[PDB]
Write a protein that binds this ligand. Structure first.
Ligand SMILES: CC(=O)N[C@@H](Cc1ccc(O)cc1)C(=O)NCC#CBr
Ligand SMILES: CC(=O)N[C@@H](Cc1ccc(O)cc1)C(=O)NCC#CBr
Lengths: 304, 304
């Protein structure tokens, strides 16, 4: 029993982290096969960041200007290219620790683990979600750029995020491993405001199922609702609309607990309208929305 | 910016996890050098668990009855001994992935990372604290026994916990790596109730400092207090007494923020007496107590 914000074991990703230096800027790289992936803003002076022309800045850079260090051993850079907002540094050595991997672009609501790194060295691991506004609420200091987000399916690491920047509101923006930003964000130190950080309704419901499985049942009530009635209340509370697809995805947790998804919706409706009244659910005083239905089943079934 | 419940990178510990089977029971082992450490209850039938005599049960066990598997490779057991509540299985092969390590016995309030494992395979990593009642609030299913808790200082893993059992209240009990239980718990399926789970005051204050550093300042007030006045309020709210030693330990965060520890105590006093009024601090609706002053400085300074 018990339910924790749980990250994937980070070992497979620790084995891929390197240091990238361009001029005075040091940040992190991901070394997979003979390619090191890093934020293209590694080439920017702090001046450049206000209005960078990456193609023009890149003309002034040669292979030998990209200093790549794996542990305390230097890698030889034999090629470099820009793909969207990432640089791909071709090195002469395949990472011997390259795991089986994929690059995936996740949807808002999806969760992943972050291995926070500084100078190519792992600092810590924590669990995040892609917010509905395409920000993530990370823990990232200056030097953490190039830190990556991932999921593991058995022995295959799906890389979904690379850390690029912090907005003036202290929320985080980054790319997939093809260098495309999540959301409308750009790698420029300009005014960029995030939109509404809505609550991931399907994730809250998953977590309420987690709570029932783990013996936390006080919030279960005598009511049901409909998708349309629930959604009226969800919109009022800046919750994402619930779709039949979400209902279908909760099907396993519905079956395991014997609680109809629309009955759990009616419980969530009352929690929104009435609050927690100083009570807690799985040790939280607010409704947690960074566990997916897949996460709750994984953690409640002990997948490795 | 940002502040997350962050675990140590688990790679160094993933490299030590093995499967231990005795008869029909499979659980996890920790392989360091040529010794595999596991809960002695691996030798128990579900019947045995009600009133086990471990010395008597162990007489019926030989080296060849302890099946140890590292990945999908079998280790040869050449010796076994009981130390307190752990078994030490001597194997013929030194773990080639043995990190630099120590066994430490932590105090209540201290935090550590858990690598939850099933069948010797890492499932996930999360952060815990030794509660004042010597329980931990983990996420552990049946098969998770032998999963370990640890801290890393640079390249040295300090192992502090091995998971042994879940109490009927779904809280967790375990040993240090010398096999001594934290608190009064025993490896028998008998009535064992935990005492008062008090709040780790110094940890709450550390986290309030974390909040100020990360721009969350609404709870800072115009008041101060004294240790004795604060402690009167702490006791009333089942908070641990604050000592001068705690004040001294917060000194770094006091200095970094310019907020006197007793001023932050007066802020915490008002939060206890008045509640959050539906507000949040670092995304929490309750006062977080599983970050140590050391954790807050580490995460706010980016130690690797
Ligand atoms: C608001 C601010 O200082 N952002 C800086 C520095 C910084 C980066 C990551 C982080 O997690 C915290 C701070 C930034 O975004 N630099 C990278 C770029 C580009 Br183009
Ligand atoms: C209440 C209950 O079923 N406890 C069992 C099974 C169990 C173990 C760990 C866990 O995390 C969840 C469940 C138990 O404590 N077995 C180990 C011993 C001894 Br001696």
């Amino acid at each position: 029993s018990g339910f924790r914000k749980m990250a994937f074991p980070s070992g497979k990703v620790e084995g891929c982290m390197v240091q990238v230096t361009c001029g005075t800027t040091t940040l992190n790289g991901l070394w997979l096969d003979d390619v090191v992936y890093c934020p293209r803003h590694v080439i920017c002076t702090s001046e450049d960041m206000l209005n960078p022309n990456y193609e023009d800045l890149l003309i002034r850079k040669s292979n030998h200007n990209f200093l790549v260090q794996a542990g305390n051993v230097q890698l030889r850079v034999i090629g470099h290219s820009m793909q969207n907002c990432v640089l791909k540094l071709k090195v002469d050595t395949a990472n011997p620790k390259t795991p089986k991997y994929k690059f995936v672009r996740i949807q808002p609501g999806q969760t992943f683990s972050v291995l926070a790194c500084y100078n190519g060295s792992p600092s810590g691991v924590y669990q995040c979600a892609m917010r509905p506004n395409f920000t993530i609420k990370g823990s990232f200091l200056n030097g953490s750029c190039g830190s990556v987000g991932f999921n593991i399916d058995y022995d295959c690491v799906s890389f979904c995020y690379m850390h690029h920047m912090e907005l003036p509101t202290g929320v985080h923006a980054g790319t997939d491993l093809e260098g495309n930003f999540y959301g409308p964000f750009v790698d420029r130190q300009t005014a960029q405001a995030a939109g509404t950080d809505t609550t991931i309704t399907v994730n809250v419901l998953a977590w309420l199922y987690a709570a029932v499985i783990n013996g936390d049942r006080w919030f279960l009530n005598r009511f049901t609702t409909t998708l349309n009635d629930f959604n009226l209340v969800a919109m009022k509370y800046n919750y994402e609309p619930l779709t039949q697809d979400h209902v279908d995805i909760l099907g396993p947790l519905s079956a395991q607990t014997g609680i109809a998804v629309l009955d759990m919706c009616a419980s969530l409706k009352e929690l929104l309208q009435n609050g927690m009244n100083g009570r807690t659910i799985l040790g939280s005083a607010l409704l947690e929305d960074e566990f997916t239905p897949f996460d709750v089943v994984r953690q409640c079934s002990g997948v490795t």
